[PDB]
C-alpha cells in the first residue's frame, strides 16, 4: 500500500471521471435509487476534497496514515476494475440480467460502502479512526483488547483474533465470514466494517451462531443486493404472497431490509426497529407475512 500525494488523488479523480462518463450512457437506463453511481462518485470526490482541505500544511501526515493509503489504493483498484468491466463486457453491459451488468451493480454497492466508511473514519475531513466508537459494548471491548485503537487490520489478523474468542469451524466458513464483513472488498477489516457486522449479527455472545442461522444456512439472505434487485427478484413470486428475502440496507448501514410480497400484490421493503432480525422473522412467520424464503415452500426454524 503506497504513499498518497496530492498527485495521486488527482489521478483517481481522472479515473472516477472516466467511470461517470461510462455510466452516463443512455443504454444503461440507470435508475436513481441507492446505490447510484452517478451520485456516489461525485460525492466521494467532494469528501476527498474536504479531507485534503483539512490537511493543508500537513500532507506528510495525511499520506502516512495507513487507513487512507489503503482506502485510496482500493479506490484506484475499484475504479480501474469498473473501467475494465465496461471494456470486456461491451454490449452485454446493456442487457438487464447479464453477468457484467450484475458486476456493475455490485461495484455500485461497493462504492457506496466505501463512501460510508470514508465518512465514518474522516467525519468533517479529519481522521478520527483512533477514537471510533463501536456500537455494541461487547464488540467494543473485543476490538480494543485485540487491536487497541487501530482503524484497519489485515483479514488474517482479524480472523485469528476473532477465532480466539469465537471459533471458526473451517476454512470455507472463514471465507464466507470474510465475504460478509469485508464490505469494501479489499482484504482488510476496518473498525467501521467491524461495527457494521456486529450490529447486524448481535448479540456478540452468539455472534457466529447468529450469522450462521441468518446468512449461512438461510435461503432468505441475499448478499450484496440492492433495493431494486430485491424488487425484481420477488417479481417472479408476485402470485405467491408471503415470499420474502432480506439483505443489508445500503443507505442505513448496520440495519436490515426485508422485502416481501403482500396478499394484495405489492412488493414492500421494511427496516425492522426495536426488534432483532430473529424476532421479526419469527413474528413475520407467525403473522403470515414472511413464509417462503426466496419463494421456497420451507422456512428455517429460528427458535
Amino acid at each position: 500500500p503506497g504513499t498518497v500525494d496530492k498527485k495521486m488523488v488527482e489521478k483517481c479523480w481522472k479515473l472516477m471521471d472516466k467511470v461517470v462518463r461510462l455510466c452516463q450512457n443512455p443504454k444503461l437506463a440507470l435508475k436513481n435509487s441507492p446505490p447510484y453511481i452517478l451520485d456516489l462518485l461525485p460525492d466521494t470526490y467532494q469528501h476527498l476534497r474536504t479531507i485534503l482541505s483539512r490537511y493543508e500544511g500537513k500532507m506528510e501526515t495525511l499520506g502516512e496514515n495507513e487507513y487512507f493509503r489503503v482506502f485510496m489504493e482500493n479506490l484506484m483498484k475499484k475504479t480501474k476494475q469498473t473501467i475494465s468491466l465496461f471494456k470486456e463486457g461491451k454490449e452485454r453491459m446493456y442487457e438487464e440480467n447479464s453477468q457484467p451488468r450484475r458486476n456493475l451493480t455490485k461495484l455500485s454497492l461497493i462504492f457506496s460502502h466505501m463512501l460510508a466508511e470514508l465518512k465514518g473514519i474522516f467525519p468533517s475531513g479529519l481522521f478520527q479512526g483512533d477514537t471510533f466508537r463501536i456500537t455494541k459494548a461487547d464488540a467494543a471491548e473485543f476490538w480494543r483488547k485485540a487491536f487497541g485503537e487501530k482503524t484497519i487490520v489485515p483479514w488474517k489478523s482479524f480472523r485469528q483474533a476473532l477465532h480466539e474468542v469465537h471459533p471458526i469451524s473451517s476454512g470455507l466458513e472463514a471465507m464466507a465470514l470474510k465475504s460478509t464483513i469485508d464490505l469494501t472488498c479489499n482484504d482488510y477489516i476496518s473498525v467501521f466494517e467491524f461495527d457494521i457486522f456486529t450490529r447486524l449479527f448481535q448479540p456478540w455472545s452468539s455472534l457466529l451462531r447468529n450469522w450462521n442461522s441468518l446468512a449461512v444456512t438461510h435461503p432468505g439472505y441475499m448478499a450484496f443486493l440492492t433495493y431494486d434487485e430485491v424488487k425484481a427478484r420477488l417479481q417472479k413470486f408476485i402470485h405467491k404472497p408471503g415470499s420474502y428475502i432480506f439483505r443489508l440496507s445500503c443507505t442505513r448501514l448496520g440495519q436490515w431490509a426485508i422485502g416481501y410480497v403482500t396478499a394484495d400484490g405489492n412488493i414492500l421493503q421494511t427496516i425492522p426497529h426495536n426488534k432483532p432480525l430473529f424476532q421479526a422473522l419469527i413474528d413475520g412467520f407467525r403473522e403470515g407475512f414472511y413464509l417462503f424464503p426466496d419463494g421456497r415452500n420451507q422456512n428455517p426454524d429460528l427458535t
Binding site: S249, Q269, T270, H273, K275
Partner: peptide, 6 residues
C-alpha cells in the same frame, strides 16, 4: 422507499 413493518 421503506415502509413500516407488518
Amino acid at each position: 422507499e421503506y415502509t413500516e413493518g407488518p
